[PDB]
């Protein structure tokens, strides 16, 4: 019956997903709304307190964040957390509450067609600081570490692409959709080349990971999950 210590990423950018409210110790955003809606559908109480994770200067390392459940600093983590295979070895995720996977974004009229263009070329590649994309590109795709440039925010994405400091950026589709809604002149090249959605994570063998999956499914089936997306993530200033 004790309050679960739930870690939440202290996002410096793309704060619509989850962030600190107005520099308080309170939190808000898309993932928080999904979690609180889901908890209402759980058949037993889930007392909890949210605990911000990160330096407040840059988006946190999501691998390190999830590891804080494994080592017991957090009882759970709630946020925009990609369900990637290495993390599933050390926590139990819910079923995903939103689709996500890595895509390539570049200037309109780029010759880049997708991640296979990057693998066979020399240009620098941007990624979001703290994203699994960094490890994915180095490890799975064997892209030279020297080519990778960490970027902090959608303004930095537009600047790096415009000034040619990177040829393209690799990041998960939800961040790229928010970027393309704010900054005109860029486009996704190719399909997703990973398919890990976002989920909440609990300790290995936690019953709450399974109970929360049924609750998330309930939200999907009633249309509440779509309405929460609409609340946080539907604004766009871009056609093309
Ligand atoms: Na920005």
């Amino acid at each position: 019956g004790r309050r679960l210590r739930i870690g939440v990423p202290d996002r410096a950018s793309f704060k619509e997903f989850v962030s600190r409210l107005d520099g308080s110790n309170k939190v808000q955003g898309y993932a928080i709304d999904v979690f609180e809606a889901a908890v209402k559908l759980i058949s037993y109480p889930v007392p909890h307190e949210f605990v911000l994770f990160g330096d407040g200067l840059k988006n946190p390392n999501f691998n390190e964040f999830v590891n804080n459940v494994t080592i017991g600093v957090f009882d759970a983590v709630v946020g925009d957390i990609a369900i990637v295979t290495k993390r599933t070895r050390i926590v139990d995720f819910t079923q995903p509450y939103i689709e996500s996977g890595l895509v390539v974004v570049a200037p309109v009229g780029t010759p880049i067609r997708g991640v296979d263009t990057l693998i066979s070329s020399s240009g620098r590649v941007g990624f979001q600081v703290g994203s699994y994309a960094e490890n994915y590109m180095i490890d799975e795709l064997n892209i030279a570490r020297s080519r990778l440039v960490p970027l902090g925010s959608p303004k930095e994405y537009a600047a790096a692409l415009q000034n040619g400091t990177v040829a393209a950026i690799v990041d998960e589709r939800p961040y790229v959709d928010l970027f393309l809604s704010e900054f005109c002149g860029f486009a996704i090249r190719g399909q997703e080349f990973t398919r890990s959605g976002w989920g909440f994570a609990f300790p290995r063998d936690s019953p709450l990971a399974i109970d929360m999956s049924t609750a998330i499914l309930g939200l999907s089936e009633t249309g509440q999950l779509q309405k929460i997306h609409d609340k946080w993530l539907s604004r766009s200033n871009c056609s093309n």
Side-chain angles (χ1 to χ4, degrees), residues 1-21 23-234 236-240:
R2 110 179 130 74
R3 307 207 329 304
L4 293 191
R5 301 181 297 279
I6 300 188
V8 169
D10 189 2
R11 293 194 63 72
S13 68
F14 301 111
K15 294 184 181 194
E16 288 91 339
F17 297 118
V18 45
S19 71
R20 194 182 280 273
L21 171 56
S24 65
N25 281 318
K26 294 181 128 52
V27 297
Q28 64 156 36
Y30 172 65
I32 304 295
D33 282 3
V34 172
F35 178 74
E36 289 295 345
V39 162
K40 296 199 201 338
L41 298 179
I42 299 293
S43 60
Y44 49 88
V46 188
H48 58 278
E49 53 151 10
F50 298 119
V51 181
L52 282 150
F53 181 83
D55 71 3
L57 307 180
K58 63 188 178 185
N59 298 326
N61 185 280
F62 274 70
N63 291 337
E64 187 187 353
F65 178 49
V66 165
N67 187 63
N68 276 255
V69 172
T70 314
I71 66 167
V73 167
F74 301 134
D75 294 302
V77 283
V78 163
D80 45 332
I81 309 157
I83 309 173
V84 300
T85 303
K86 290 181 185 210
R87 296 177 185 168
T88 74
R89 287 283 298 280
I90 63 165
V91 292
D92 283 357
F93 285 92
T94 68
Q95 291 295 283
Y97 63 86
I98 185 175
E99 307 151 54
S100 187
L102 292 184
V103 296
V104 178
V105 65
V108 164
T110 182
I112 293 161
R113 310 305 307 268
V115 67
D116 288 328
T117 312
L118 294 182
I119 289 162
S120 288
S121 65
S122 262
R124 292 211 295 164
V125 184
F127 68 90
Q128 190 185 161
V129 67
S131 178
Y132 79 94
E134 182 180 10
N135 310 94
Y136 192 83
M137 283 196 283
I138 293 165
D139 294 331
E140 276 88 344
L141 300 180
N142 202 19
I143 292 165
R145 288 193 173 257
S146 65
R147 287 174 73 191
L148 303 186
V149 178
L151 299 172
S153 69
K155 279 172 166 188
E156 289 173 57
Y157 287 19
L161 286 170
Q162 285 168 354
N163 66 25
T165 57
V166 304
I169 296 173
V170 162
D171 202 6
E172 294 177 86
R173 177 64 165 265
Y175 307 106
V176 173
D177 285 345
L178 270 187
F179 168 58
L180 293 179
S181 77
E182 189 179 354
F183 291 95
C184 293
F186 311 100
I188 292 173
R189 317 302 305 128
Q191 180 99 345
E192 284 78 3
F193 56 95
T194 69
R195 298 204 14 104
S196 299
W198 296 344
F200 307 140
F202 302 87
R204 296 266 311 189
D205 298 325
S206 173
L208 195 49
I210 299 164
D211 298 334
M212 288 281 294
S213 300
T214 302
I216 289 158
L217 178 64
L219 298 179
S220 183
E221 285 287 276
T222 61
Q224 284 171 81
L225 193 57
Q226 185 61 46
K227 286 292 177 180
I228 297 169
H229 192 275
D230 292 348
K231 173 173 177 203
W232 291 99
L233 297 168
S234 61
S236 183
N237 193 62
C238 297
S239 270
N240 60 333

